[PDB]
């Protein structure tokens, strides 16, 4: 269903931890008093990434705010997925190959096939 | 230009918070994550962008990002952020 991607490719303890992370993300987004005032330089850079595409013309103030929040979740869940491979190799330093290994566990990350060759 | 990437210090801060307090992150892991999250933006924006051009509109809005996220198989991201987007407007 809707939350298939939370757990896709994970087994054992990792599965419960990513599900609990997503329940925490959802509780947070459901809270009634959000501050939508994020740093001038981060939103300037988000807009610049969006605007690097010639097909984009004008960008709503809403769009960069959805991405600021969405990117925090993306980075967090992928770092947490990559950490599993660091633990399996008895390491406390995350390496590029832990990210590559994590991308291969779920087809949600297929869009990154050329960004991280594996 | 090279405006294709989010700044790396913000990416590395979010990564640091995702890991146990005594974990370390290799420079190449930070750079990899930076490129991954920047394509996440570019990938979704490009879908949202095409639909906008095909429906003759100029502005890309919040609904367009969420619609692009469900189209591209980021359904959990669209559903979770739906809640967030509604609160923004009220």
């Amino acid at each position: 269903g809707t939350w298939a991607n939370v757990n896709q490719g994970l087994q054992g303890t990792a599965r419960d931890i990513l599900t609990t992370y997503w329940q925490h993300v959802i509780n947070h987004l459901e809270s009634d008093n959000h501050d939508y005032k994020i740093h001038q330089l981060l939103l300037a850079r988000i807009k610049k990434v969006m605007k690097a595409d010639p097909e984009v013309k004008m960008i709503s103030a809403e769009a960069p705010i959805l991405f600021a929040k969405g990117c925090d979740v993306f980075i967090t869940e992928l770092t947490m997925r990559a950490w599993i491979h660091a633990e399996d190799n008895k390491r406390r330093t995350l390496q590029r190959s832990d990210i590559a290994a994590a991308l291969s566990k779920s087809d949600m990350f297929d869009f990154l096939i050329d960004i991280v060759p594996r | 230009e090279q405006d294709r990437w989010l700044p790396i210090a913000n990416v590395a801060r979010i990564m640091k918070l995702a890991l146990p307090e005594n974990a370390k992150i290799a420079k190449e892991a930070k750079e990899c994550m930076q490129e991954c999250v920047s394509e996440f933006i570019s990938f979704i924006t490009s879908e949202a962008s095409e639909k906008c051009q095909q429906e003759k509109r100029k502005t890309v809005n919040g609904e367009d990002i969420l619609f692009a996220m469900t189209s591209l198989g980021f359904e959990n991201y669209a559903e979770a952020l739906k809640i967030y987007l509604s609160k923004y407007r009220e």
């Binding site: 297929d110 869009f111 050329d114 | 394509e39 990938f43 189209s71 198989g73």
Partner: peptide
């Protein structure tokens, strides 16, 4: 190493980003 079929929701948008990415890299 290089699979024929990837995520069905993402494939077409992947193909298009490969084109858009070459053109951005054409400026340099």
């Amino acid at each position: 190493e290089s699979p024929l079929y990837v995520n069905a929701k993402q494939f077409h948008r992947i193909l298009k980003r490969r084109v858009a990415r070459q053109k951005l890299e054409e400026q340099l």
